[PDB]
Design a protein around this ligand. Structure first.
Ligand SMILES: [Mg+2]
Ligand SMILES: [Mg+2]
Ligand SMILES: [Mg+2]
Ligand SMILES: [Mg+2]
Ligand SMILES: [Mg+2]
Ligand SMILES: [Mg+2]
Ligand SMILES: [Mg+2]
Ligand SMILES: [Mg+2]
Ligand SMILES: [Mg+2]
Ligand SMILES: [Mg+2]
Ligand SMILES: [Mg+2]
Ligand SMILES: [Mg+2]
Ligand SMILES: [Mg+2]
Ligand SMILES: [Mg+2]
Ligand SMILES: [Mg+2]
Ligand SMILES: [Mg+2]
Ligand SMILES: [Mg+2]
Ligand SMILES: [Mg+2]
Ligand SMILES: [Mg+2]
Ligand SMILES: [Mg+2]
Ligand SMILES: [Mg+2]
Ligand SMILES: [Mg+2]
Ligand SMILES: [Mg+2]
Ligand SMILES: [Mg+2]
Ligand SMILES: [Mg+2]
Ligand SMILES: [Mg+2]
Ligand SMILES: [Mg+2]
Ligand SMILES: [Mg+2]
Ligand SMILES: [Mg+2]
Lengths: 110, 56, 48, 150, 142, 103, 117
RNA sequence: CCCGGCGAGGGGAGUGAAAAAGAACCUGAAACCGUGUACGUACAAGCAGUGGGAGCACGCUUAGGCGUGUGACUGCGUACC
RNA sequence: UGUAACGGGGCUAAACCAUGCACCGAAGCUGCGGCAGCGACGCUUAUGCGUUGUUGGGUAGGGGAGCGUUCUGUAAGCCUGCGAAGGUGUGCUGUGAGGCAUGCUGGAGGUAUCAGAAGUGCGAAUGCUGACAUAAGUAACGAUAAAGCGGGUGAAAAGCCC
């Protein structure tokens, strides 16, 4: 069976989380957690808490054997950008986009 | 200096063709504490090569 | 004879021109004014 | 449009398209280029063209067997139910009733009947003569319409 | 019914061996190019290599008319500024004579990927011996 | 055994049982058409070459379908001259099945 | 009587972008670019219905030439021969026979030769 | 009820006709960004298509040298206003 | 800048002159199928049809015939919770603008026909508003007065507390 967890409106651009999502796609969840634990990236902290949520969802809600799970899907989508303005030199103003992302992790025993 | 033409989504992806991270491949297990750890680093409970080297 | 079976005499309600509505119409772009000069302008033209 | 006549930005130098009025019809919130005014849509109709049209209409009704002539047409009381009943008995449903003089009872009895209109000969009009399945006229109404159409 | 097209996976390509000894360079090259393209076969198909494999022996004896042995010049440029280079026919024949027949045929083959593939079926040697008896080349007087 | 014949301003090489698409023929479906001017008949190394037609050579066929082909789009566009148009076109066809080649 | 254009405009753009399927980059995504791509596609297509008739005849000829030379005569004389023999088989058919019935093609060459002899 | 910081966010449960209405909440287009599969792509030069066209994949018809997707190779080809 | 004064290869003819016959070669000409404009005449004109000659590149521009959008009447009619509008596919059809049918989405409206009226069609105006790309995970993170360690709080501490 498949079980999902998501972190929506995470404070990172999708680009930065994807570097990390890619490390673990297709992996046994045990190896995925090890990989995430020793990836020095903020996005590794974010994705690990989602994977851990998915694992607990699967055990608690769907009766899964945590030994058997794999990260069968993982994808990062683009969230809303927060818009800001940064004063630059000579009275000129620049747009700042504070991008966010939606992190989805799917686990399954098959 | 700035572009005369908009680079493509194709080009962006080519540029990024070396950006992927490497997963750590060298974890070990301490033989006394059973903790995982980076090779040549102590463990979180402060074990190294089987000895408790740091009380913390 | 009903309110939806009455029509006007052939040729008695010719359709108005509508300039500036594309190539197919024949009156697109310049709208039959040709190119440039006083007569092509809004309000342009000389007196009687 | 409400707002002021201030040029939104200087004519040259900023790199924007030149602007002149915040109420330009090119602009969101701007005026309507050829904004509308109240207009009078009525048309002249030549008197003779009017009567001629009526004549043609009446002649098709006859020819289509949609015109029905009777001596009298009235009801005994301003009760919709009575008119409805009379109409059923006459095998009429969607109908214009045209009488010689206004009839009050008949007028009131007819008002809530959507497929029915009542009219004195003086007040007929072209679209009413068309818009109902049948038209019933009293002899007097005929005699008056005739006089009207010379 | 669509016209026939040859098919890369079933095209038959046979092996030949030619002796360049005494042949007029460009009149030999046109025939080599013809046959390497498949021009001589009814199954000729402009997008398919239907031509044959041809070994050319004794490239160093190829012939040329007029004064071209001493006067014909091969030019090429190295890509570095000022790097224009040249050799006479006679200098070519003494340094690598194979190049003469190869350059001539390549100019006469189509340009682009298929024409470069067509060239790969040409095996030219300076002398009288090849190492492709396994391919059983058939003598071709061309 | 095949045979060669002209129909619709074009020529065709056919054998018995073959279905071949021609320009529209004003012949009703299920009728049999005869093509009695045939340019060549060849059956297994015997080869009759018409000069221009083969004597006694007839190809018999059955009209099987009339129809219109897939639409073709005509586009005309003269750049910078404020001119363009299109037209859509479908071509009529008759399919005939070859039922006899008489040499 | 205010008219909003969205439904009509959307159908128009979609009709173009649909014809742009398979095209690269903005050509299959971005209306302005797709529209120009679809037009050029029609232009070439118009052109190439004429060219197609040229290229195929050029193919047939080239193959007839090859098969003629295999039987010892050149295309140009072979054609002249057949014309003088009142043979009217066209070049599509002759190119087919050149490939699929080598024995009939040879027979056609002998008819050409005879008419030239 | 569960993971989480007595978070954000999520997975269940339940309400409801519907949560393919969950509060950024009717419908939910387009640009733009992803995950997955099919086909192509690391000896190859240009408005990126069009004409020819192998092969692969997927449906046919129960075969028939057909639909769909892809597009090696090849002729032609310098966008729009 | 580099062969660079046959387009190239190459050619002693694959050059030049002369004669001849062949062939290639265009959207020209023919052949087959089809549409329309203008004529003409017919089997027979209530006006289109049927034959039949011919014509059918086009900017500015003139002329002619149409599609579709919104609103009024027709309409207390007709379709629609057994699924309207809109969105997204597909099939058929029209010369085209388009039309109709239908799968999925959607969930309350739509509107034949013939007329009537227009805020009626967008790719450009350094157009207007909004949304989202690109450069790019690039520059930068604001005085070069400067930090180091122990302990604490905390999910987390170079930056907070001692
Ligand atoms: Mg300031
Ligand atoms: Mg007007
Ligand atoms: Mg102008
Ligand atoms: Mg001028
Ligand atoms: Mg002028
Ligand atoms: Mg306003
Ligand atoms: Mg008056
Ligand atoms: Mg070329
Ligand atoms: Mg798309
Ligand atoms: Mg062109
Ligand atoms: Mg919550
Ligand atoms: Mg329920
Ligand atoms: Mg739910
Ligand atoms: Mg919504
Ligand atoms: Mg390769
Ligand atoms: Mg390139
Ligand atoms: Mg030279
Ligand atoms: Mg001569
Ligand atoms: Mg031609
Ligand atoms: Mg012509
Ligand atoms: Mg509406
Ligand atoms: Mg509708
Ligand atoms: Mg109307
Ligand atoms: Mg324009
Ligand atoms: Mg840079
Ligand atoms: Mg840098
Ligand atoms: Mg820096
Ligand atoms: Mg600072
Ligand atoms: Mg934090």
């Amino acid at each position: 069976m498949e079980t999902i967890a998501k972190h929506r409106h995470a404070r990172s651009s999708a680009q930065k989380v994807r570097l990390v999502a890619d490390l673990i796609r297709g992996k046994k969840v045990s190896q995925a957690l090890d990989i995430l634990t020793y990836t020095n990236k903020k996005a590794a902290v974010l994705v690990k808490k989602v994977l851990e949520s998915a694992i607990a969802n699967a055990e608690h809600n769907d009766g899964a054997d945590i030994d058997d799970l794999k990260v069968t899907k993982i994808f990062v989508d683009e969230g809303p950008s927060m818009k800001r303005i940064m004063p630059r030199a000579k009275g000129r103003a620049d747009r700042i986009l504070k991008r966010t992302s939606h992190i989805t992790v799917v686990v399954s025993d098959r | 200096a700035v572009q005369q033409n908009k680079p493509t989504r194709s080009k962006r992806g080519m540029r990024r063709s070396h950006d992927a991270l490497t997963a750590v491949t060298s974890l070990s297990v301490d033989k006394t504490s059973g903790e995982k750890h980076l090779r040549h680093h102590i463990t979180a409970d402060g074990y190294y090569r089987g000895r408790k080297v740091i009380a913390k | 004879m009903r309110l939806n079976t009455l029509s006007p005499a052939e040729g008695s309600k010719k359709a108005g021109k509508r300039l500036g509505r594309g190539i197919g119409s024949g009156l697109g772009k310049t709208g039959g004014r040709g190119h440039k000069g006083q007569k092509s302008r809004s309000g342009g033209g000389v007196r009687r | 449009v409400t707002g002021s006549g201030k040029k939104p930005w200087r004519q040259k130098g900023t790199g924007r398209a030149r602007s002149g009025s915040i109420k330009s019809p090119i602009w969101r919130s701007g005026g309507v280029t050829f904004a509308a005014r109240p207009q009078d849509h009525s048309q002249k109709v030549n008197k003779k063209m009017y009567r001629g049209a009526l004549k043609s209409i009446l002649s098709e009704l006859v020819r289509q067997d949609r015109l029905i002539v009777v001596e009298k047409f009235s009801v005994e009381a301003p009760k919709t139910k009575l008119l409805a009943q009379k109409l059923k008995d006459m095998a009429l449903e969607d109908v214009l009733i045209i009488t010689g003089e206004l009839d009050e009872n008949l007028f009131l009895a007819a008002r809530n009947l959507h497929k029915v209109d009542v009219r004195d000969a003086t007040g007929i009009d072209p679209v009413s003569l068309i818009a109902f399945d049948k038209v019933v006229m009293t002899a007097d109404a005929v005699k008056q319409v005739e006089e009207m159409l010379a | 019914m669509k016209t026939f097209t040859a098919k890369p996976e079933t095209v038959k390509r046979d092996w030949y061996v030619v002796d360049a000894t005494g042949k007029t360079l460009g009149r030999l090259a046109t025939e080599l190019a013809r046959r390497l393209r498949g021009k001589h076969k009814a199954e000729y198909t402009p997008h398919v290599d239907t031509g044959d494999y041809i070994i050319v022996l004794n490239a160093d004896k190829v012939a040329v008319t007029g004064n071209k042995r001493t006067d014909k010049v091969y030019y090429h440029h190295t890509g570095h500024i000022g790097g224009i280079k040249q050799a006479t026919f006679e200098e070519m024949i003494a340094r690598r004579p194979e190049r003469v027949i190869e350059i001539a045929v390549k100019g006469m083959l189509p340009k682009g990927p298929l024409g470069r593939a067509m060239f790969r079926k040409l095996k030219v040697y300076a002398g009288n011996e090849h190492n492709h008896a396994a391919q059983q080349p058939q003598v071709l007087d061309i | 055994m095949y045979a060669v014949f002209q129909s619709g301003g074009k020529q065709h090489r056919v054998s018995e049982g073959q279905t071949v698409r021609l320009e529209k023929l004003d012949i009703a479906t299920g009728e049999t058409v005869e093509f009695a001017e045939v340019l060549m008949i060849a059956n297994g190394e015997e080869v009759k070459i018409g000069v221009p037609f083969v004597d006694g050579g007839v190809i018999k066929a059955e009209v099987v379908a009339h129809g219109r082909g897939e639409k073709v789009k005509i586009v005309k566009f003269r750049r910078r001259k404020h001119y363009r148009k299109q037209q859509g076109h479908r071509q009529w066809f008759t399919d005939v099945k070859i039922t006899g080649i008489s040499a | 009587a205010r008219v909003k254009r969205g439904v009509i405009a959307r159908a128009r753009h979609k009709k173009i972008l649909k014809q742009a399927k398979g095209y690269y980059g903005a050509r299959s995504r971005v209306y302005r670019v797709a529209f120009q791509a679809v037009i050029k596609a029609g232009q070439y297509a118009y052109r190439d219905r004429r060219q197609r008739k040229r290229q195929f005849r050029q193919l047939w000829i080239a193959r007839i030439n090859a098969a003629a030379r295999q039987n010892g005569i050149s295309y140009s004389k072979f054609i002249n021969g057949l014309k003088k023999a009142s043979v009217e088989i066209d070049r599509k058919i002759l190119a087919d026979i050149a490939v699929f019935d080598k024995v009939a093609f040879t027979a056609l060459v002998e008819k050409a030769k005879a008419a030239l002899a």
